[PDB]
Design a protein around this ligand. Structure first.
Ligand SMILES: Cc1cc2nc3c(=O)[nH]c(=O)nc-3n(C[C@H](O)[C@H](O)[C@H](O)COP(=O)(O)OP(=O)(O)OC[C@H]3O[C@@H](n4cnc5c(N)ncnc54)[C@H](O)[C@@H]3O)c2cc1C
Ligand SMILES: Cc1cc2nc3c(=O)[nH]c(=O)nc-3n(C[C@H](O)[C@H](O)[C@H](O)COP(=O)(O)OP(=O)(O)OC[C@H]3O[C@@H](n4cnc5c(N)ncnc54)[C@H](O)[C@@H]3O)c2cc1C
Ligand SMILES: Nc1ccn([C@@H]2O[C@H](COP(=O)(O)OP(=O)(O)OC[C@H]3Oc4nc5nc(N)nc(O)c5nc4C(S)=C3S)[C@@H](O)[C@H]2O)c(=O)n1
Ligand code: SMO
Ligand code: SMO
Ligand code: FES
Ligand code: FES
Ligand code: FES
Ligand code: FES
Lengths: 285, 162, 786, 162, 105, 52, 285
């Protein structure tokens, strides 16, 4: 269970990190190491060199400007879950982070590492896409941007190309009131299904809705059918239930030792219905 | 050379050790520095047996490269006792029988100190929540919760001696 | 008493020269001695010693030493005094003065070399660097530099005592003046032996590891008495005994020096407990001369009266020991003169005796035990006087002895000093020794040596020796002490045997010979037996000393092995339908005695004892591991003789031991090869003591001999080839008839050499009664000839 | 660094060890290299217990600075045996009971090998003469002389295997 | 606090080990049998010194005394010390060995 | 090899058993084998077996 | 018993050695180490640095030229005792070396080290003086020469000045026939007394004699009285005896634990008589 051999570098600048990766195609980036080291322990990957981003200070920056929250790739789950700016701008973020692993892991894990790892059951890839965030990626050719949805293409599959570095994520401050929840064997456990609901109400009537499901399929599922159904309706138990059915119909979860396809769908429906009601509650009051 | 010079403070003392990048911090502390108190139960970050404090924060040493300890202040179980006496938290573990085989204990203490540092008298529920990342196969957990919430532990924590 | 039990055994391995199992690791650099031990975080101790024989310690400054990098601690006498008052040494002897030796001098030092401060550092070199930084202010005081001064001077060596006489005893006080005044003949001498050092090639050493989380202490030490050390550390350091384990690695020679409790052994334990890390003490050669123990320094004013036929009428002996500043533990200053006078009559019948033993304190390191202890001085004096008496009468040295030795028809015989002779070959030894020597040819060789300016001399020494030293022997010697020596024997499930002993080896072959004993008792190959020693975790014993290993080992292992053997016989008898008492075990076969066909292999019976519940007879105790202590019911006297031929150059006074003959009777020999090794080794040390070795203190108490350049031990050019013959008179008090002999040559061989030199110079009407016999002493003796 | 990098061949293998000038070769072999077969009995060059072969010649390692081993080929007692079997000389010592406590043995073997290298069948007198620089307090020397002059040893010496 | 348990080495004793909830029982039985053998020898010595039958000697709170008469008692350590080092206090036929081994089932 | 002795440190619940089995399955004389058990971090029966 | 601390240097040239010793007054030279290390073990000297001569090749040279044997300071007792050139030019040298210590020590000890150590009981200082050798000493200023007799001024006392290096010893090939002997507890032991006898015999009569005693006094004693007496005499027991008396009269040995003054003198006389007879025997041979 020992890591295979590799060299190590921790450059002081983003530009240098890019140069190292460009010069050595077999080199790989290491951020918090909470997802990469387990893979190394199993010898599932054989990097020639690990390039640490610990010394690239710009990647640790958190700032807000003109309605948008900017979070650097090396910002840990801990900082994101406790930072004042993040809390005031995007309160749904720290609430979602409460579900990510445990304290020890959140002390090293980063937003960028989580997004680049792209586990289909991870909270961040799901949340960023759902919040309509934008990722900024740097390479030898410059900096480019891509939407969070386009960034996350599948399980362990991102829009990232060889030699590229995720620098930061820009999150538009939401107008919708968001609530999140998920089903996990034990709090902290990788979720079988997760759901987020963002609502806007005019009195007791919904005027805007964004329902999304994660960990059910390889990418976040924006439940358009549900969104359109909730618009113009009073959100009560029966309505939330119907929206939940609309949000899960068409989904194709995979059966494994932790749950069959049917169980997954049943859970997806239950969790979605729950979060919708919770969102409507917070939105109105 | 395949070895890298790493400078870090361990249990209050500046140390210099040589390690290859392929070695995680747990192994480095145990085999290079010679502090076997830190235990390894999975090397996957799940069991928490290797939990230590890095710059005051609990982290999995099996998921931390030894080379990443550069410039950090590490605290392992060996640094807890002051003089030749168990500190308040350790003594409470003993009084409440919070350990049997003792393999998970080093990690338990690390997480526990982290909790008490932020809150001298946490509720049993808060303790069970934060301690959920540390596995124990012998005790059933209850006595660990008892030890952490013991009044002598709370008093020591308030005086900053946990 | 059950401890007196003498188990029965059929000799098979015993009596054969089995090759030593320890030799393989010792020939490949894989022996594990005290200095070879490596412990994590191990620290090193160095010592600052007193440069004065007797001085008040005005002040001590250790600030600079404590500050030197690498130094972790520096202690003076006051620091230690708070943890332990020191080594308390006493004896159940009327008038004996108890002494308490402080681990570190505190306020006053009583001999050059006494420790005044200790430093613990990252390395021995750095500890020494720091020790040189310590500032000590002394106030030299008048010191007691010798026996004369101790007895007639005003100065007192040890101020905690009343006078310098530590002990004074006289077990026989017959009126001899009229006998010496009227006897046909008289010979007298004022014999003197200088101090000598056991000088083992490996110096003393110990490593302590105290663990506060368990409160347990492990003390590794090159000792001959592990159980003793454990108990004394517990008492003198006030540490619970069960929390202490003493381990003994391979030891590079002991010879008695390592049969004492050393202040340093206690110190490392105290230091390790104080620092929470292992503390290593490995002394250098100078420290071995300065702070261990010295031995053999006694003066014997002896007189022998005899009739016209050479029959001894009386023996008078005033014996005085230069004991040093304190009593060593556990032998004390009684280790020389006191125990020596108890056996002063040796093998002879002397009707009238008057002797006194005096031990005096002097400002020198304490006198201590060294192979042969106090028996040597008197042996030299008596045998030398016996030879002189013979020459005066025109009798051969062998003939005068035949006329005074306890004869075969005499046993049992109790001499004037209360020693009862029960079984030995005294007479036969004298006769065999003469045959080996061939005096007729020697006389021819001697006469023809004069023409070449060479003085040739023949020396004879006949002895008996107390072995298997236990309670009974210690009582006889006037040093009452109850001994305890247990052994454990386990028959492993597959039929192999595991023996655990309290005996500690320092090269005398226990690892091999004890296996031979166990093998014979249980009727299995010695190769199927393993000897476990060097740990106090199990068994308890006084260790190896006073030629007791073979005897005590035979007895204890015998008893323990017998217990489990009986259980095997009971099970076998049950399966074979025969009384247990009628079952024997031989060549690995358990069968009805006299009927080999009615049996089962040893492994099969043992297998059933462990794992076949249904085969057990009613009331059976399936436990196949047992422990038992053993202590002989009476003295176990060994005997023998030595003859040496020396050649002295008339012009250069150079002395050479050209021949050496030995006759030994240690009852049943376990391993003849090993026994002869013991004889040759002892003979070499004897030549050293008599012609080369001397630890010298000058008129001011300074130790002038602290190096191998000034302290000469024998080399390949000093020891001749040696001829040995054996006689066996089995002891009925020890299994297999085994008797001891470890010290034999150092008790008697020195006498043979001194007697030889005197025979060589007899024609010049000169005598030499002081050892070592150096060219200076020979030169002086001849210059002052009549 | 007060430590010097020393390059020497030890028992046929090229070795590199770090030592201070103040440390003699005996201590370096024992404590730095970890070959405790070489023993120390006086540190004054008299006893011969630390005798080893340097470039084929016997020398007192206690009187050789560890740094003086640079560029030399050293042979300690550990290098004598081949394939977990005593060689002729060692086996002879055992058969003749040429050792007891065994502390002087490593040094005895070094000197004996040197003697046998020049003369496969030395006389007893020649052996006693050359061995006069090696002290033994246990045996009385006779059996060591016996072991060295054993015919099997002489034969092995002629075949260059002692 | 005056007792120490040594385990983890096959140098002495032999057993099947800990399994099938047998430790407390097997330990109690075997240690009990072994301690009893040496306990009896202590009582035999105490009886001799106190002029009483061994079967009437009791050891409690480190005190060796005649049952019901803690007045004619001796501290445990004193009796043991005599067992080891006071040969003259031993009763006839005494076995001074204070270390014993026993199997239990 | 110089003593032909074997020391086996193993996290086992049955030391004597292991010693006897090593001797049997490896054809090594039993008296030359010593099994040592350090502190063990839980067994629950798993460490009550002879492992290859 | 552990050496005190010090630095170490082993320069490849004599000039560098001289420079180092000159630059550091507390630095000391080390050759074979057989006399210096024991002193260090007893901490009787505290050098700041030890300057090894192992890499100064010229100091290892042995050569002959015009009736004189040149032996470098770093030539070991072993080489001197076995080298062919030495054996043919000064056969008395190897015969004397047989008495020096033992094999192991002789494998490291050097002629230069023995001479510089200057133990009054050592064989080399006594022999070189007796054979009328010349020492060549190097310093920053160059090379100077001094007779062996002037070189050895006393016990641990030589003509060597601070920073100087004994480079070689030149021994005149003797015309006299030499024999040597000494008295030591055991052969190899430091002698209580040593003596050398160089004789020239024309027929069975002595024509020239050089008798010398060592270890009796702090410096070699050239027994002129004995030399003069032997001239013209047939050397027999009585003559050798008379010469021995003349050679030892006036000598004042120091009394110590290994022998009194009187013993020393008696032994010196016995040994001298013995060596004279031996030299007479060999000379006529
Ligand atoms: C026991 C355990 C439980 C966990 N539970 C959960 C959970 O409940 N939910 C969850 O979401 N996660 C969970 N995680 C994973 C955690 O969130 C990881 O920290 C995260 O997935 C990876 O971030 P990281 O900073 O550790 O990155 P790393 O492991 O270092 O690596 C992430 C991957 O992205 C690459 N990479 C890193 N940073 C960049 C960058 N800026 N640009 C480009 N490539 C980059 C690396 O090369 C690697 O392939 C768990 C981990 C453990 C050990
Ligand atoms: C056990 C033992 C027994 C011995 N017995 C005898 C004996 O019987 N007879 C005998 O004569 N000797 C004896 N020796 C000593 C031996 O001869 C030494 O080797 C010799 O005295 C010193 O030579 P060395 O090359 O070892 O020099 P080193 O010990 O290195 O040093 C000798 C001294 O000379 C200085 N020095 C060395 N070379 C030079 C140079 N070229 N120029 C200037 N200064 C220099 C050093 O600085 C030092 O002060 C014995 C030694 C030992 C250890
Ligand atoms: N009948 C007998 C008697 C003895 N022996 C063997 O010879 C040995 C020594 O005999 P013994 O008289 O039984 O004495 P110990 O075993 O108790 O050894 C101690 C004894 O041994 C002597 N010889 C020594 N030899 C060495 N190598 N090292 C020491 O330290 C020695 N110390 C001395 C001194 S002092 C003493 S007291 C035994 O162990 C035994 O292996 C035998 O084979 N048959
Ligand atoms: O240890 Mo031996 O009796 S002097
Ligand atoms: O070791 Mo427990 O019997 S399953
Ligand atoms: S060993 Fe690190 S989490 Fe289990
Ligand atoms: S006490 Fe055993 S795993 Fe916790
Ligand atoms: S330790 Fe080297 S010769 Fe004694
Ligand atoms: S075998 Fe012990 S010193 Fe030689």
């Amino acid at each position: 269970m020992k890591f295979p051999a590799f060299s190590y570098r921790a450059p002081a600048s983003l530009q240098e990190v890019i140069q190292v990766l460009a010069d050595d195609p077999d080199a790989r980036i290491i951020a918090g190491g909470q997802s990469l080291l387990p893979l190394l322990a199993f010898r599932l990957v054989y990097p020639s060199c690990l390039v640490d981003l610990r010394n690239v200070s710009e990647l640790f920056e958190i700032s807000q400007s003109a309605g948008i929250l900017s979070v650097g790739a090396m910002v840990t789950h801990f900082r994101n879950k406790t930072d004042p700016t993040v809390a005031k701008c995007v309160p749904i973020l720290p609430k979602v982070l409460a579900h990510v692993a445990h304290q020890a892991v959140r002390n090293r894990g980063t937003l960028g590492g989580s997004l680049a790892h792209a586990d289909a059951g991870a909270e961040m890839p799901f949340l960023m896409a759902t919040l309509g965030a934008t990722m900024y990626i740097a390479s030898s050719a410059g900096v480019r941007s891509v939407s969070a949805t386009d960034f996350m293409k599948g399980h362990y599959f991102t829009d990232l190309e060889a030699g590229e570095v995720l620098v930061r994520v820009e999150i538009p401050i939401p107008a919708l009131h968001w609530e999140f929840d998920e089903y996990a064997r034990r709090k902290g456990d990788y979720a079988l299904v997760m759901a987020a609901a963002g609502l806007s109400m005019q009195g007791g009537r919904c005027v805007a809705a964004r329902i999304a499901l994660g960990a059910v399929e390889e990418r976040a599922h924006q439940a358009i059918r549900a969104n359109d159904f909730l618009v113009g309706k009073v959100i009560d138990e029966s309505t939330a239930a119907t929206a939940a059915e609309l949000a899960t119909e068409g989904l194709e979860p995979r059966s494994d030792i932790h749950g069959s396809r049917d169980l997954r769908l049943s859970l997806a429906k239950a969790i979605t219905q729950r979060v919708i009601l919770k969102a409507a509650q917070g939105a109105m009051y | 050379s395949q070895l890298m010079r790493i400078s870090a403070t361990i249990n209050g003392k500046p140390r210099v050790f040589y390690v290859e990048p392929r070695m995680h911090l747990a192994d480095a502390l145990r085999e290079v520095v010679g502090l076997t108190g830190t235990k390894i139960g999975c090397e996957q970050g799940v069991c928490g047996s290797c939990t230590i404090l890095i710059d005051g924060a609990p982290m999995r040493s099996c998921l931390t490269l030894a080379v990443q300890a550069e410039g950090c202040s590490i605290e392992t179980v060996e640094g807890l006792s002051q003089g030749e006496k168990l500190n308040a938290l350790q003594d409470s573990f003993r009084r409440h029988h919070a350990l049997q085989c003792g393999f998970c204990t080093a990690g338990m203490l690390a997480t526990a100190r982290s909790i008490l540092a932020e809150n001298p008298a946490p509720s049993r529920d808060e303790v069970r929540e934060v301690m959920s990342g540390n596995l124990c196969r012998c005790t059933g957990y209850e006595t660990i919760i008892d030890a952490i919430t013991d009044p002598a532990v709370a008093e020591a924590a308030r005086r900053g001696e946990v | 008493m059950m401890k007196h039990e003498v188990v029965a055994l059929k000799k098979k391995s015993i009596g054969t020269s089995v090759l030593r199992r320890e030799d393989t690791r010792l020939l490949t650099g894989r022996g594990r001695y005290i200095a070879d031990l490596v412990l994590s975080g191990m620290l090193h101790v160095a010592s600052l010693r007193s440069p004065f024989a007797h001085a008040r310690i005005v002040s001590i400054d250790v600030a600079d030493a404590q500050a030197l990098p690498g130094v972790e601690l520096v202690w003076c006498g006051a620091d230690v005094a708070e943890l332990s008052q020191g080594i308390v040494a006493t004896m159940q002897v009327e008038g004996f003065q108890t002494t308490i030796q402080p681990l570190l001098a505190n306020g006053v030092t009583r001999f050059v070399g006494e420790i005044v401060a200790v430093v613990v550092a990252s390395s021995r070199a750095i500890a020494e660097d720091a020790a040189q930084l310590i500032q000590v202010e002394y106030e030299e005081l008048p010191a007691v530099t010798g026996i004369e001064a101790a007895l007639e001077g005003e100065a007192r060596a040890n101020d905690t005592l009343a006078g310098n006489v530590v002990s004074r005893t006289s077990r026989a006080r017959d009126e001899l003046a009229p006998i010496f005044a009227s006897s046909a003949g008289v010979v007298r001498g004022q014999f003197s032996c200088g101090r000598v050092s056991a000088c083992p090639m490996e110096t003393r050493g110990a490593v302590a590891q105290y663990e506060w989380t368990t409160q347990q202490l492990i003390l590794w030490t090159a000792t001959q008495m592990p159980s003793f050390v454990r108990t004394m550390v517990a008492m003198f350091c006030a540490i619970p005994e069960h929390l202490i384990e003493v381990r003994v690695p391979d030891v590079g020679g002991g010879f008695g020096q390592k049969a004492h409790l050393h202040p340093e052994e206690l110190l490392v334990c105290l230091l390790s407990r104080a620092l929470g890390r292992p503390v290593r003490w490995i002394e250098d050669r100078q420290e071995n001369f300065l702070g261990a123990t010295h031995a053999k320094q006694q003066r014997n004013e002896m007189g022998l009266a005899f009739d016209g036929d050479g029959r001894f009428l009386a023996l008078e002996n005033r014996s005085i020991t230069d004991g040093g500043a304190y009593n060593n533990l556990p032998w004390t200053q009684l280790v020389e003169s006191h125990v020596g006078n108890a056996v002063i009559l040796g093998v002879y019948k002397v009707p009238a005796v008057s002797e006194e033993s005096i031990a005096v304190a002097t400002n020198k390191c304490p006198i201590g035990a060294y192979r042969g202890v106090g028996f040597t001085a008197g042996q030299i004096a008596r045998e030398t006087l016996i030879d002189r008496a013979a020459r005066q009468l025109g009798l051969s040295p062998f003939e005068i002895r035949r006329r005074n030795v306890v004869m075969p028809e005499d046993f049992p015989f109790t001499n004037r000093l209360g020693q009862t002779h029960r079984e030995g070959t005294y007479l036969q030894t004298i006769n065999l020794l003469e045959e080996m020597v061939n005096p007729e040819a020697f006389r021819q060789r001697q006469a023809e040596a004069r023409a070449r300016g060479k003085y040739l001399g023949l020396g004879v020494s006949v002895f008996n020796e107390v072995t298997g030293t236990g309670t009974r022997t210690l009582s006889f010697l006037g040093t009452p002490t109850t001994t305890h020596d247990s052994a454990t024997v386990r028959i492993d499930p597959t039929g192999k045997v595991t023996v655990t002993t309290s005996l500690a080896s320092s090269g005398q072959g226990h690892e091999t010979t004890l296996a031979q004993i166990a093998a014979d008792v249980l009727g299995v190959p010695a190769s199927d037996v393993v000897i476990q020693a060097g740990s106090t975790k199990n068994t308890y014993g006084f260790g190896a000393y006073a030629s007791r290993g073979a005897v005590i080992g035979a007895g204890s292992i015998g008893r323990a092995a017998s217990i489990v053997r009986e259980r095997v016989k009971q099970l076998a008898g049950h399966l074979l339908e025969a009384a247990s008492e009628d079952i024997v075990i031989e060549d690995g076969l358990v069968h009805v005695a006299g009927v080999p066909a009615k049996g089962m292999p040893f492994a099969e019976v043992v297998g059933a004892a462990y794992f076949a519940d249904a085969t057990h007879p009613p009331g059976f105790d399936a436990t196949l591991e047992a422990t038992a202590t053993y202590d002989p019911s009476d003295l176990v006297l060994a005997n023998g003789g030595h003859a040496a031929i020396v050649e002295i150059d008339a012009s250069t006074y150079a002395t050479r031991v050209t021949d050496f003959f030995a006759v030994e009777d240690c009852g049943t020999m376990i391993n003849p090869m090993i026994v002869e090794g013991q004889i040759r080794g002892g003979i070499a040390q004897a030549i050293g003591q008599t012609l080369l070795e001397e630890v010298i203190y000058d008129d001011f108490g300074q130790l002038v001999t602290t190096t191998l350049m000034d302290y000469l031990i024998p080399t390949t050019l000093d020891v001749p080839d040696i001829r040995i013959r054996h006689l066996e008179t089995p002891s009925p008090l020890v299994p297999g008839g085994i008797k001891g002999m470890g010290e034999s040559a150092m008790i008697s061989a020195p006498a043979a050499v001194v007697a030889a030199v005197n025979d060589a110079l007899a024609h010049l009407e000169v005598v030499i009664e002081t050892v070592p016999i150096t060219p200076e002493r020979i030169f002086r003796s001849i210059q002052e000839r009549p």
